[PDB]
């Protein structure tokens, strides 16, 4: 066969150890999910806006008593209600409180006041993967593989907790000071033992079964991994067009084209992740995640060493001081106004 006796026993043992880790990870998550005003605004100095979404914005802040820097996600409660994202917001906080994994951002504090909700998490200073990818053009296959392997492990972890992530893209991936990935946004993540049906995600990264309004499962995350690996290695995604509807037609078509510089191993991995047929998609078969981790394209990946953050990263972002923001774009600074009247108090009681 492909493995001799020594490699075969080593791999089996490694896979078993993953099971034991994940079982313990699940019991820790569930304990924390079942039993979670950890600070206040005056405890931080607001430095600079790091990013904005429909919710509000993310600001670099310095915790005054300790001098530590953090990223503070500020959500305007009235905007959240108008956007119909109450459940998404409470769910994101609950996930962030309960998970623990080296590539998942760590929530330090959370609190709320009359007008806003606050999530204070570790500041990830190296910038968005998106910027780095667009600047560099494309990542070499070893560089893309280093990032991919972190997503594989992160999804292996999240899926064992029955969490589907559903919004993988370079825009949602931050680079930390050691060059490793951090995932921060969980606004579309959901606990899904079986199927779910919500149309959500980002056009270029949608699995065909979402587009086709089917009940779908965690395998949509493995399709999105295919799209991510493709985009990292090519510099552009496999399916693009002027308008989303044309992107969708391409996704569901079963056709994908590859750059001529893609290795054969990469193309084979991608044909099996970007597989429209669920009965054949890697990550969705009897062998589970092992079909991906054991694939030839990942043969040089030492999965434990990636997890332990013992692999030297191919790229280490520019790092000056602890509150340096040079790896982030400039955003327009809007003041954080706090109404004298409580807004949407009932909707956010649990936050």
């Amino acid at each position: 066969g492909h493995m001799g006796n020594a490699a075969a026993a080593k791999k089996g043992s490694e896979q078993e150890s993953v099971k034991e880790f994940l079982a313990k990870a699940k019991e820790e998550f569930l304990k924390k999910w079942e039993s979670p005003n950890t600070a206040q605004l005056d405890h931080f100095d607001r430095i600079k806006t790091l990013g904005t979404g429909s919710f509000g914005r993310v600001m670099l802040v310095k915790h005054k008593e300790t001098g530590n820097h953090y990223a503070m996600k500020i959500l305007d409660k009235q905007k959240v209600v108008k956007l119909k994202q109450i459940e998404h917001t409470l769910n994101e906080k609950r996930i962030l409180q309960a998970v623990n994994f080296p590539f998942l951002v760590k929530l330090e504090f959370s609190f709320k006041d009359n007008s806003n909700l606050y999530m204070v998490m570790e500041y990830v200073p190296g910038g968005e993967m998106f910027s780095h990818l667009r600047r560099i053009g494309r990542f070499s296959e070893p560089h893309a593989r280093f990032y991919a392997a972190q997503i594989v492990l992160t999804f292996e972890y999240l899926h064992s907790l029955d969490l589907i992530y559903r919004d993988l893209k370079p825009e949602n991936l931050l680079i930390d000071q050691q060059g490793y990935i951090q995932v921060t946004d969980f606004g579309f993540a959901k606990r899904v033992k079986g199927r779910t049906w919500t149309l959500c995600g980002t056009p270029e990264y949608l699995a065909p079964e979402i587009i086709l309004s089917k009940g779908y499962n965690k395998a949509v995350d493995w399709w999105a991994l295919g799209v991510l690996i493709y985009e990292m290695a090519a510099g552009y995604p496999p399916f693009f067009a002027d308008q989303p509807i044309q992107i969708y037609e391409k996704i569901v078509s079963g056709k994908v084209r590859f750059p001529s510089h893609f290795s054969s191993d990469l193309k084979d991995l991608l044909r099996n992740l970007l597989q429209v047929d669920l009965t054949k998609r890697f990550g969705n078969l009897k062998n589970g995640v092992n079909d991906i981790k054991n694939h030839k394209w990942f043969a040089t990946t030492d999965w434990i060493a990636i997890y332990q953050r013992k692999v030297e990263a191919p790229f280490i972002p520019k790092f000056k001081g602890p509150g340096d923001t040079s790896n982030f774009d400039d955003y327009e600074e809007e003041e954080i106004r706090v109404s004298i009247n409580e807004k949407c108090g009932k909707e956010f009681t649990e936050f």
Binding site: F130, D167, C200
Partner: peptide, 18 residues
């Protein structure tokens, strides 16, 4: 080229969720 086509799509910047 495919890259040129990507540029022509106009979806080269940060993409929003639906």
């Amino acid at each position: 080229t495919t890259y040129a086509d990507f540029i022509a799509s106009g979806r080269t910047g940060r993409r929003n969720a639906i």
